């Protein structure tokens, strides 16, 4: 005989600051690097494969997550959390907007969806937030090209270029030098390659390394070379030996 | 530390059993004295019942649960209602679904249940409030202890109440007598009045304040209260 | 309509006729009668237009959140499984007879479904009001040793026979290549084979005959 | 029952031998008079050693050992390996609390090593009946006369494959809503034998 | 709402000075076609008492599992003592006259009429009915369906009031319900050749006779052959 | 009664080039007696227009529904639905009220105004989806009107040569019902101006 | 203290929180149940502490059963382990209805296993102050499983729980050891009589009434029995003779 | 809230107290185990300790066969053991019903580690402290094996050693690998694997294994098994005449 | 024990105030600065947009600027994250209004029934309330414009000029002076800037 607690985990403090959402913004340094950055003429998201043991392989692991096929997803902080999040986001996609539409939904709208779920489990006891932030980037054809942040709360920000993991501040600062004006989508992943490249050491490694543009549909993205009938995949990730070319090219 | 454990009821505690349990027990002795007595063809029960004032009167503490059964309590009064109308409904239900008159040991083990389960809460609770069942089926007439804890032992005699142990080696000495007392409403009677006098070190008896009942091989569960118990004195 | 699937020992043909009637009259010359589930999963439908296609997108939901979920391909016998279990609940509520072929890593799959609740698996299968007239042919003319041409060929014979023998069927066929080895080919408007119901040439009216009460304009807004 | 007129070969059996039970039946679906399928299954598999032969209407037999498929699979996995008896427990549970929308009449049939083979009835209403043999579908009245004189108990495995064999065969011949192939899943510690005849093999033999 | 597709038939039943005797058929009817022979419809309940179910397989299978239970939760709680406070036919009776009543009232029926036989350990003769329009009745010979018809004018004439009832021995009342089953098998061919034929003596408990054939065999009419349905051309 | 042919009503809509028309009786009656000359059976959000012609109460639930869905949807997006879209949205409202008790034929009307192209699709009783862009029809005398359409319609036109189609077209096939009088309007559109013509037509 | 005393809704660096350590205890201070398993059965012994001349012989039995082949013994507090049971019975005859057969032995142990595992993961819900020894016959073979407040069980060969457990335990071991498992059902119920003598020496103030009970395949045919009259007075004898303590 | 040591939430060095200890202790079971993958097979070899001989052995398994194909190790303690395995089996019975198709060792894995994470943040429920191992010779990749932590954590493995002598194991499994340079044994027949599997835990733990203290499961195409007591002292045998 | 994780936060004090509640207040002090300037000829809302990287972009301006009807919009001083659970059902309470009557919303209406829900989360359920305060900008033909606040603690008032948010007080001062009962548009979007300037916890205005 149980269900009967709603009483809250999260709770204001006499700073009017939350309690679970402190410790949550160390959890985020705790992880690791992932930047993203917009050229306006796509968004490359990159992170760092790694895993806990020698005999586990960071070729079969994932960090970035299709959520719809034109989207893709990468966070920092804590894997189980990151998991049930992206599943639970993966559904809601599905049921109102290719249900009640057809038409895959806009990015900025689908991060609406992630951050009301976020909150939701702040507000209510017996479930805490989340542990997470995200950048979510994407595509409409409304919209163009998209990128947006969600911070642990459930609070949201656009952003053309930010970083997030260990050497936050000093990541995002690095790309404001870097990369001015509008650039190339080729020519940002030639930049975001090095700005992983200096906040990592100890792996430079291709099969622990993973970049993604959403920058190109082709049909070979699409699964058939007919006739369209769908959008499909504008989320592409490059290959181990892609990755591998671009290091020694700079 | 004491606040830890008796302000939970989903605990335990070193002894092998929880502190509300100690107290729960406590309590049955906070009642009023009641013997029980059988020979296993008929079932008396005799309670000293005392009323509060010169200026209150007595209300009843003997239940007929059906007429063929029925329970004394000692102990918390609220909780005794409690429980009377759980082994009422259940006497009911023997009835019409299986043509019974319910042995006590069926009975002993639902109640049973059903105090376990409000430990398997918070804001259920124990009970506090013991009750000597008794009817007479086709295996006789039997006599239960039932505690709010869920011990269930059948007994040729007992008390519970403050000072059980008076009549209870009173008892186990004129036993051996009474058991083959087979078959008389009359010495049983004569007995449990005898029995409960034992109990007595601090208190009166006299004729409004002692209560009798019975049921047996040849009586349907009927009480003698008030008046009708002078001529047993 | 004439829905029909046909295998060979390289993949799988699927195809069907576009034509939507209300009465003898052409409302449309082209409807899908096609569905895409997944890029590999094609399903041909055939019966009321309206149930083939909503129970059709409810299972190409669950199927895609189900291929993202497990970072593996989706199997045709999920699809087919899901179909089964909607028509159970609502008990033949749902009127869709379904053609279901897919390609997976495991082989090539041929089956199809009766909007009576049955599935069966077959090496050709067809239905619609061409049913009859279709699998006839596929009967006839299917052999072991089939191959992509010969494949194709067959189809547009099975589609041809329902069209000319139904004359509630008609209109633009389209054709959808399913293979193992390549990516898979749908083909939109194969064949553009029979025409609109009979016009007599139309010209312009006169305006000393066309008169209007009074008009005014007006304009769209959006704040 | 479900939705219009689903039908299947309608002469199925299962047989006891020396060796466990061969289970028998015709393949063929139709809808009306279309054929909807000339070779199909309906000897089914709801364990490894426990097949069914599905009799009734095709669809709703379908739904009925999808559901059997999945609590065997559940109980296999908790509870251990189960009986025919068991098996069949499944099937009439749905047959009975469906008997007012669904018609499943099964022969559930199976193998075990420390009691032989086994065989059980499930009327439409749902019904659990032990017989040493059962023939089912409407055409097994015909050949009632047949399969109570040339079953014996002990026989060996091509010989029971004959009998089997000749009992259906003269079913199909009667019947028509029957046809295509025979199919024969022979349940034995040799293992699962599927048996495939042709449509002018059984016709000779 | 349900609608017959298998029937059973045949329970005639009757009262002696000192028991009880039922016999029936072993019958799984689909209509005409003796489908299953070697479906029970005498379920002996303990060793003092016997279901006897007529009517439909389907229901029978569902009440073959909750006589089961019942023999089950009996010895629940009572470990000893279980004939005399267990099995008796008056609970048994009860027991499935409840759910047929309620599954009636809510229009899911049990289709099925029931004779429950006995002796009482507690009591003296046992046979009360029970049916899927929820009446119930006790009368020195019950039969049901077709034997409701035939048997039971027979066996009327064995038993029909209390002053009829010393007046049949052992002996005659097994000739009674050996002569009524022959009758039932000769005039109804849903009667089974093989039938099962239970005492229940109010000395000896249960005695059980199993696969037993109708014999005596009437094979008379042969001789009076005339024709009856024959054409002449 | 009728089911949807109480109050009757029937609806054009076609496609020429960078204009779309749309088109509507203005009956309401009450049996085969006419009621009124007035009822207004199209209605638009933004620059998409929805005509649904049947049963009256049936056409008002629906047009309630899709402009709660469409301003709300408008209100997170920052910007008007899309014709495109709306047909979409139509589907899948009607999918769930087949299993309700609606009568109604929508069509579905606008031009895009970042995509530029006219666009036109048809809904049904049953609510299944059709892709034509040429004319659509549908009402009580959506029989007369295909036959009448097919002929009368040729592709391609100019707003005035769709008027003087969509005009004729509509008073020949209305002129053979009595459930099609009582007025009507045509609506012709432009993305960015709409020219309303009241025609003059028989009553019973 | 460490907030683990009176919560079951977290985890703990014993591996196990410490209240349901507290109910451990409680089933060493009941009184002494054992488990015999033979070449063609099990048998079931328990020690009832007899007080007061007031009791009545085998109706205040602890021994309790389940169907009609399942035995159930256990020991510590009284009402844990009659609700125990009690949830045992509505899941086996459940089990009875819906597959139509006799619950297994090791089907019955995980009917139970998971409802004593389910309130040691809520806080809310009251551990299982008893051990219970069961087993019986069954279809596929004789089994002897014991259960515990954990949700621990695997299969035995003997078994025991309450006060004498530990000495209980060292006879058993090698008595089931010197034969090839305690020969046959009856030789066994001599020997359990000697356990249950031996065992109320740890418990000498309180006398005691032997109970035993038995579902052996050979020597009872496939029921569950209380063994009693003749043969239980023979055993007590038996033990008097070697034993004289 | 306010609370800590009594119901479960973030902490702020990080490092959750609950997830912590419920890595430590597991290993109350005397347990060590490992799986390694040999070319068509995959092969599970596990301790067995029998602490009495009132006891059977062969009631005493930490393999847990959850469909026909899919195997599952569990360290732990065995009542969250075979929570686990209760829960593990019917949902995958329910996914082989709906989906047509034997569940993945990937999606289970990913099905009972997103339970745990919501238990984690339940303030009424704890999460199991249960280490799965699961395992099989799938046909659509090959074999697999995947291991999942009670975190929420579960990654992909070349081979794996779970118990304290994790370190040890790892280490005789690096050097294998970094001479052959490959993620798996290529040894055709399971047979040869199991005993290479078996030499290598002898020398990490340090001890020569009986019958009675190995159990050994082998995954196979399209069946598992459990191997005997009889097969189990086969494997000794045969490497005592290699030098 | 449930009760044994409780604490109760959710009660009045023995000063007689919520712990919560109170706490609320404080946050959208820590917040960007909001003015509402209500004018009989529009209304003028200003939002604070604190942390501004020039990796942010400029490309936005609804992030706390929120249509919740096409008359009605608001200026959120508080998270992104508090306001957009209430956002959302204020969206929806418009268009029941709408649907109903056929007409739009009237302000003083929606703005009761998000305060009444903020109240109910403080008494019953357990829960933490929002903290956030909007300021309501929205026009009837019944009342011209209106303009209302509401914050955490269920209170509602009308203004027809408010601050809130980091230095409301002295904001409001300025508010006071240069305030004036003749009114235009073009006017007060002078009177918010020169405003605007003066409160910035920065040197100068951008």
Request: hydrophobic share 35%; net charge negative; glycine share 8%.
């Amino acid at each position: 005989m149980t269900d009967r607690y709603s009483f809250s985990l999260t709770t204001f403090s006499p700073s009017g600051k939350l309690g679970q959402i402190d410790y949550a913004l160390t959890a985020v340094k705790q992880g690791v690097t992932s930047l993203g950055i917009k050229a306006t003429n796509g968004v490359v998201i990159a992170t760092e494969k790694k895993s806990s043991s020698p005999l586990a392989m960071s070729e079969t692991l994932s960090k970035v997550s299709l959520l719809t096929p034109d989207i893709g997803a990468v966070y920092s902080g804590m894997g189980p959390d990151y998991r049930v999040l992206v599943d639970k986001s993966r559904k809601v996609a599905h049921t109102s907007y290719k249900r009640i539409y057809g038409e895959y939904p806009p990015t900025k709208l689908l991060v609406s969806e992630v951050a009301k779920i976020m909150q939701e489990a702040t507000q209510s006891g017996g479930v805490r937030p989340f542990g997470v932030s995200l950048l979510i980037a994407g595509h409409d054809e409304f919209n163009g090209f998209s990128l947006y942040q969600v911070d642990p709360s459930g609070s949201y920000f656009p952003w053309k270029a930010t970083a997030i993991g260990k050497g936050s501040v000093a990541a995002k600062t690095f790309l404001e030098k870097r990369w001015n004006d509008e650039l190339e989508l080729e020519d940002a992943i030639h930049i975001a390659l090095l700005t992983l490249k200096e906040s990592v050491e100890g792996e430079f490694n291709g099969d622990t390394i993973e970049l993604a543009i959403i920058g190109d549909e082709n049909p070979d993205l699409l699964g058939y070379t007919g006739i369209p009938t769908d959008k499909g995949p504008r989320f592409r990730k490059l290959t181990s030996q892609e990755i591998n070319d671009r290091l020694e090219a700079l | 530390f004491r606040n830890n454990y008796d302000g939970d009821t989903v605990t335990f505690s070193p002894t092998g059993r929880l502190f509300q349990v100690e107290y729960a027990l406590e309590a049955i002795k906070q009642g009023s004295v009641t013997v029980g007595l059988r020979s296993n063809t008929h079932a008396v029960l005799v309670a000293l019942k005392r009323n509060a004032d010169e200026l209150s009167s007595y209300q009843k503490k003997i239940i007929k649960c059906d007429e063929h059964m029925g329970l004394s309590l000692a102990g918390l009064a609220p909780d005794a209602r409690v429980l009377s109308n759980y082994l009422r409904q259940q006497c009911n239900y023997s009835s019409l679904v299986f043509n019974r008159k319910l042995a006590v040991e069926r009975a002993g083990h639902l109640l049973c249940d059903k105090a376990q389960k409000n430990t398997q809460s918070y804001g259920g609770r124990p009970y506090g409030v013991g009750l000597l069942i008794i009817g007479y089926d086709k295996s006789g007439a039997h006599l239960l202890e039932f505690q709010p804890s869920g011990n269930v032992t059948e007994l040729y005699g007992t008390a519970i109440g403050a000072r059980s142990q008076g009549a209870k080696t009173y008892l186990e000495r004129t036993l051996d007598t009474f058991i083959k007392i087979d078959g008389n409403p009359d010495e049983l009677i004569k007995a449990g009045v005898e029995a409960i006098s034992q109990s007595l070190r601090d208190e009166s008896l006299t004729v409004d304040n002692l209560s009798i009942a019975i049921v047996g091989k040849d009586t349907p569960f009927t009480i003698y209260d008030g008046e009708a118990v002078a001529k047993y004195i | 309509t004439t829905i029909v699937g046909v295998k060979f020992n390289n993949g799988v043909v699927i195809a069907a006729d576009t034509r939507s009637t209300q009465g003898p009259i052409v409302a449309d010359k082209n409807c899908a009668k096609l569905h895409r589930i997944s890029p590999k999963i094609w399903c041909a439908g055939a019966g009321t237009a309206a149930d083939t296609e909503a129970v059709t997108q409810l299972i190409g939901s669950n199927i895609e959140l189900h291929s993202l979920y497990t970072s593996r391909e989706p199997r045709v016998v999920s699809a087919l499984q899901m179909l089964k279990q909607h028509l159970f609940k609502y008990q033949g509520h749902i009127g869709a007879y379904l053609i279901v072929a897919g390609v997976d890593p495991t082989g090539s799959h041929l089956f199809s479904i009766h909007a009576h609740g049955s599935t069966d698996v077959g090496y050709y299968l067809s239905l619609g009001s061409g049913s009859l007239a279709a699998m006839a042919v596929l009967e006839s003319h299917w052999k072991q040793d089939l191959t992509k041409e010969e494949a194709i060929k067959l189809a547009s014979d099975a589609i041809q026979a329902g069209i000319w023998n139904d004359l509630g069927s008609g209109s633009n066929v389209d054709v959808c290549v399913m293979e193992i080895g390549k990516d898979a080919e749908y083909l939109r408007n194969y064949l553009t084979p029979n025409v609109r119901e009979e016009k007599q040439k139309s010209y312009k009216f006169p305006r000393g005959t066309t008169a209007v009460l009074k008009e005014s304009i007006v304009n769209i807004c959006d704040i | 029952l479900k939705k219009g007129e689903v039908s299947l070969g309608t002469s199925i059996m299962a047989v006891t031998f020396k060796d466990g039970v061969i289970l028998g039946a015709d393949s063929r679906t139709t809808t009306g008079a279309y054929i909807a399928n000339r070779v199909t299954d309906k000897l089914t598999r709801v364990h490894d050693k426990i097949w069914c032969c599905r009799s009734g209407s095709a669809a709703d037999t379908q739904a009925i050992a999808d559901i059997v498929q999945y609590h065997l699979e559940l109980y296999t996995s908790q509870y251990g390996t189960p009986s025919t008896e068991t098996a069949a427990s499944v099937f009439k549970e749905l047959c009975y609390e469906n008997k007012d929308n669904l018609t499943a009449g099964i022969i559930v049939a199976g193998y075990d090593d420390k009691n032989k083979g086994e065989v059980y009835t499930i009327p439409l209403g749902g019904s659990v009946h032990k017989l040493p043999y059962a023939i089912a579908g409407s055409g097994s009245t015909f050949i009632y006369g047949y399969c109570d004189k040339n079953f014996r108990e002990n026989m060996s495995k091509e010989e029971t494959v004959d009998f089997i064999k000749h009992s259906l065969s003269q079913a199909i011949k009667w019947d028509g809503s029957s046809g295509g192939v025979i199919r024969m899943v022979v349940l034995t510690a040799a293992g699962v034998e599927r048996l495939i005849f042709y449509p002018d093999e059984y016709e000779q033999l | 709402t349900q609608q017959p597709i298998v029937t059973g038939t045949s329970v005639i039943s009757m009262k002696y000075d000192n028991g009880v005797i039922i016999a029936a058929d072993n019958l799984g009817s689909y209509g005409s076609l003796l489908r299953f022979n070697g479906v029970e419809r005498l379920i002996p309940v303990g060793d003092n008492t016997v279901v006897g179910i007529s009517g439909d397989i389907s229901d029978m299978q569902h009440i073959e599992r909750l006589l089961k239970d019942l023999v089950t939760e009996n010895a629940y709680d009572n470990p000893l003592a279980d004939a005399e406070e267990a099995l008796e036919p008056s609970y048994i009776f009860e027991y499935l006259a409840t759910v047929m009543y309620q599954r009636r009232s809510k229009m899911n029926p049990l289709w099925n009429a029931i004779i429950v036989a006995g002796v009482q350990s507690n009591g003296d003769q046992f046979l009360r009915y029970v049916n899927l329009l929820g009446v119930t009745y006790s009368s020195p010979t019950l039969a049901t369906g077709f034997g409701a018809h035939m048997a039971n004018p027979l066996l009327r004439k064995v038993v029909d009031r209390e002053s009829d009832i010393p007046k049949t021995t052992v002996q005659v009342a097994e000739e009674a319900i050996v002569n009524a089953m022959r009758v039932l098998y000769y005039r109804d061919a849903r009667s089974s050749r093989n039938f099962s034929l239970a005492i229940i003596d109010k000395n000896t408990g249960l005695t059980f006779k199993k696969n037993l054939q109708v014999e005596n065999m009437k094979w008379d009419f042969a001789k009076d052959i005339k024709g009856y349905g024959t054409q002449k051309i | 009664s009728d089911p949807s042919s109480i109050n009757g009503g029937i609806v054009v809509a076609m496609t020429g080039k960078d204009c779309v028309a749309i088109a509507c009786d203005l009956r309401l009656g009450s049996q085969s007696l006419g009621v009124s000359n007035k009822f207004e059976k199209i209605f638009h959000y933004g620059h998409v227009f929805l005509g649904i012609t049947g049963l009256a109460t049936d056409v008002t639930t629906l047009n309630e529904m899709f402009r709660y869905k469409t301003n709300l949807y408008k209100l997170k997006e920052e910007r008007a639905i899309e014709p495109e879209t709306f047909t979409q949205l139509v589907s899948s409202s009607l999918y769930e009220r087949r299993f309700g008790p609606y009568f109604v034929g929508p069509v579905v009307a606008g031009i895009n105004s970042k995509s530029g192209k006219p666009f036109i699709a048809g809904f049904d009783l049953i609510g299944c989806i059709d892709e034509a862009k040429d004319f659509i029809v549908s009402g009580t005398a959506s029989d007369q009107l295909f036959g009448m359409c097919e002929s009368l319609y040729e592709p391609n036109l100019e707003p005035e040569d769709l008027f003087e189609t969509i005009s004729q077209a509509l008073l020949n096939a209305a002129d053979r019902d009595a459930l099609s009088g009582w007025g009507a309007v045509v609506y012709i559109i432009k993305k960015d101006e709409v020219v309303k013509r009241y025609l003059k037509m028989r009553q019973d | 203290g460490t907030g683990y005393d009176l919560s079951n809704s977290v985890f703990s660096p014993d591996g196990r929180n410490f209240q349901v350590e507290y109910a451990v205890k409680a089933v060493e201070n009941g009184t002494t149940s054992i488990g015999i398993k033979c070449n063609d059965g099990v048998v079931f012994a328990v020690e009832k502490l007899i007080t007061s001349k007031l009791l009545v012989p085998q109706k205040n039995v602890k021994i309790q059963v389940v169907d009609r082949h399942i035995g159930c013994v256990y020991s510590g507090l009284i009402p844990d382990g009659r609700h125990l049971v009690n949830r045992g019975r509505e899941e086996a005859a459940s089990f009875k209805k819906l597959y139509k057969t006799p619950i297994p032995i090791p089907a019955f142990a995980d009917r139970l296993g998971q409802y004593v595992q389910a309130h040691t993961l809520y806080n809310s819900v009251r551990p299982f102050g008893v051990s219970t020894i069961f087993g019986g016959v069954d279809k596929n073979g004789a089994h002897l499983y014991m259960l515990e407040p954990s949700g621990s069980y695997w299969g035995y060969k003997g078994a025991a729980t309450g006060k004498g457990r530990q000495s209980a335990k060292a006879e058993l071991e090698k008595l089931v050891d010197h034969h090839p498992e305690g020969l046959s059902a009856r030789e066994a119920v001599k020997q359990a009589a000697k356990i249950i003598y031996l065992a109320h020496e740890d418990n000498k103030e309180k006398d005691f009434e032997l109970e035993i009970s038995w579902c052996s395949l050979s020597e009872t045919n496939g029921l569950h029995k209380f063994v009693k009259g003749d043969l239980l007075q023979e055993a007590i004898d038996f033990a008097q003779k070697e034993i004289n303590g | 809230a306010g609370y800590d040591r009594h119901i479960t939430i973030f902490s702020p060095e990080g490092r959750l107290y609950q997830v912590e200890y419920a890595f430590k202790a597991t290993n109350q079971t005397n347990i060590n185990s490992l799986a390694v993958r040999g070319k068509d097979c995959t092969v599970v070899i596990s301790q067995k300790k029998v602490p009495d001989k009132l006891l059977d052995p062969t009631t005493v398994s930490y393999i847990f066969c959850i469909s026909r194909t899919i195997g599952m190790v569990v360290n732990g303690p065995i009542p969250d053991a075979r929570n686990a395995a209760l829960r593990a089996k019917a949902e995958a019975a329910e996914f082989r019903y709906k989906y047509g198709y034997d569940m993945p060792c990937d999606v289970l894995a990913k099905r009972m580690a997103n339970l745990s994470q919501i238990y984690t943040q339940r303030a009424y429920m704890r999460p199991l402290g249960v280490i799965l191992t699961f395992v099989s010779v799938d046909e659509e990749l090959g074999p697999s094996i995947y291991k999942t932590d009670p975190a929420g954590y579960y990654v992909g493995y070349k081979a794996t050693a779970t118990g304290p002598k994790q370190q040890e194991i790892t280490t005789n499994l690096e050097n294998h690998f970094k001479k052959s340079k490959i993620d798996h044994i290529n040894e055709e027949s399971w047979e040869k694997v199991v005993e290479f599997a078996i030499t290598h835990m002898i020398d990490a733990l340090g001890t020569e294994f009986s019958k009675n203290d190995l159990e050994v499961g082998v995954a196979t195409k399209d069946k598992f098994f459990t191997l005997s007591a009889e097969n189990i002292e086969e494997r000794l045998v045969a490497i005592a005449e290699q030098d | 024990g449930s009760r044994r994780y409780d604490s109760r936060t959710t009660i009045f004090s023995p000063e007689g105030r919520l712990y919560q509640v109170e706490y609320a207040l404080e946050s959208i002090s820590h917040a960007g600065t909001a003015i509402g300037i209500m004018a009989s000829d529009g209304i003028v809302l200003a939002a604070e947009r604190k942390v501004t990287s020039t990796l942010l972009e400029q490309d936005t301006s609804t992030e706390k600027l929120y249509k919740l009807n096409d008359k009605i919009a608001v200026a959120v001083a508080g998270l992104t994250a508090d306001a957009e659970i209430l956002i959302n059902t204020a969206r929806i309470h418009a268009q029941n209004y709408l649907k109903t009557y056929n007409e739009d919303i009237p302000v003083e209406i929606l703005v009761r029934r998000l305060s009444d829900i903020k109240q109910g989360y403080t008494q019953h359920g357990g829960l933490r309330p929002f903290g956030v305060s909007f300021i309501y900008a929205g026009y009837d033909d019944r009342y011209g414009y209106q303009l209302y606040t509401s914050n955490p603690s269920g209170n509602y008032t009308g203004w027809k000029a408010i601050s809130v948010g980091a230095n409301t007080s002295a904001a409001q001062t300025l508010l006071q002076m240069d305030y004036k009962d003749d009114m235009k548009v073009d006017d007060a979007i002078e009177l918010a800037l020169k405003t605007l300037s003066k409160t910035t916890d920065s040197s100068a205005l951008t």
